[PDB]
Design a protein around this ligand. Structure first.
Ligand SMILES: Nc1nc2c(ncn2[C@@H]2O[C@H](COP(=O)(O)OP(=O)(O)NP(=O)(O)O)[C@@H](O)[C@H]2O)c(=O)[nH]1
Ligand SMILES: *C/C=C(\C)CC/C=C(\C)CC/C=C(\C)CCC=C(C)C
Ligand SMILES: [Mg+2]
Lengths: 192, 190
């Protein structure tokens, strides 16, 4: 339908985030304890890093569809102009298994509880919320990969067509790292 | 020689025996003198259901001032050993207050196994009377059992690092649960 889009749509702790804390503040607690220093080094690790408040802490680079079948690789480059995703739509073949892979850089401090929330709409009716806990990471030069658990695209006569997506990243602090909309289209086959 | 490697992280209030369990699992000799706060991570070859399997083991700092540092090791994790001490009803109380919210938040569909540390203290007199000093008794196995049920763990295993009893068994359950693979994200969506 277009109406009963709202029935389909009807298919929808508390942890509390830590008091805020800086990496420098972290490195100074129990500075005496050699096992605890090493623990920090294993996680942070062997120092040294950037720190000028000016750069953002987290920068997300690409969101990529991993899926054996697929004939092209499918990617949103999120360094370029996010504005212009409103002007193109990606096909995803109905009924396929996929994972989503997110690359990002952490610069300066710990991201605590980074997640990716994704709202999916059709004919102005929100039909899915989804979020993947990407988790906690400390700053380093080399970027991070993160794969979501395996999922399958939907299928059937209804499921085929055009969806409107609002994605964002946030964390347990509510930092607004990134937001954008894009379009998706579900077809019998792949484009390429 | 080489093998599947599964990541295992161990959480729990402090004083619950996390570090000791790990030491004894590697070294085989319960600390004589000094206990480190955190044991360096390492890996253990372990053979379960006649399957060569490798287990990467991470000790953690359970104190609240590391509430932000600690979750750095959750990503990648295959299974979580959530610990309390049998000689501390206060630690068992903290399981659905602090630990499982944190773990179910940071590792959504990752299995958990409830680990009751220091069995040897259940029927140790000094212990029985120090708890009785504040109107408490040691934790009952049937109390731990339904905690496991309450938090939805893979199972409830209890042990004693000092006496070695049940330690071997603890990690085989962990492996068993790491080699398990069917979970999430419950049909959503759609
Ligand atoms: N009797 C007995 N004592 C134990 C056992 N395991 C640990 N302990 C003791 O209880 C104390 C807790 O030590 P520990 O193993 O460091 O636990 P922990 O959770 O790592 N503490 P922390 O968070 O500070 O690192 C130690 O002094 C140790 O001697 C056990 O099986 N039996
Ligand atoms: C019963 C539900 C119907 C008819 C439609 C539901 C279809 C959904 C929720 C598809 C949305 C999933 C997407 C956009 C995942 C793709 C993400 C990337 C390629 C990064
Ligand atoms: Mg410890």
């Amino acid at each position: 339908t277009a109406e009963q889009l709202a029935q389909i749509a009807a298919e929808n702790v508390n942890y509390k985030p830590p008091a805020q804390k800086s990496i420098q503040e972290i490195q100074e607690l129990d500075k005496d304890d050699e096992s605890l220093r090493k623990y920090k080094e294993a996680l942070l690790g062997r120092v040294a890093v950037s720190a000028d408040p000016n750069v953002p802490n987290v920068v997300v680079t690409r969101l990529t569809l991993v899926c054996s079948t697929a004939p092209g690789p499918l990617e949103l480059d999120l360094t370029g102009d996010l504005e212009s995703f409103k002007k193109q739509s990606f096909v995803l073949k109905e009924g396929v298994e996929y994972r989503i892979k997110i690359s990002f850089r952490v610069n300066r401090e710990i991201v605590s509880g980074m997640k990716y929330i994704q709202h999916t709409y059709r004919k102005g009716v929100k039909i899915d919320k989804t979020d993947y806990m990407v988790g906690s990471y400390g700053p380093r030069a080399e970027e991070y990969e993160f794969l979501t658990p395996m999922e399958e695209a939907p299928k059937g006569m209804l499921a085929r067509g055009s969806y409107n997506i609002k994605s964002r990243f946030t964390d347990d602090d509510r930092t607004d790292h990134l937001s954008w909309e894009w379009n998706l289209t579900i077809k019998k086959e792949w484009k390429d | 020689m080489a093998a599947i490697r599964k990541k295992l992280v161990i959480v729990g209030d402090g004083a619950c025996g996390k570090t000791c369990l790990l030491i004894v699992f590697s070294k085989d000799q319960f600390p004589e003198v000094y206990v480190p706060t955190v044991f360096e991570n390492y890996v253990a070859d372990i053979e379960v259901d006649g399957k060569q399997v490798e287990l990467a083991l991470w000790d953690t700092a359970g104190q609240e001032d590391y509430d932000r540092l600690r979750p750095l090791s959750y990503p990648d994790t295959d299974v979580i050993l959530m610990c309390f001490s049998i000689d501390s009803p206060d630690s068992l109380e903290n399981i659905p207050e602090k630990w499982t919210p944190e773990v179910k938040h940071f590792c959504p569909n990752v299995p958990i196994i409830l680990v009751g540390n220091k069995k040897d203290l259940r029927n140790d007199e000094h212990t029985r009377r120090e708890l009785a000093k504040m109107k408490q008794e040691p934790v009952k196995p049937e109390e731990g059992r339904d905690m496991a049920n309450r938090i939805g763990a893979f199972g409830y295993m209890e042990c004693s690092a000092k006496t070695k009893d049940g330690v071997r068994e603890v990690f085989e359950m962990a492996t068993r649960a790491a080699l398990q693979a069917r979970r999430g994200k419950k049909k959503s969506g759609c």
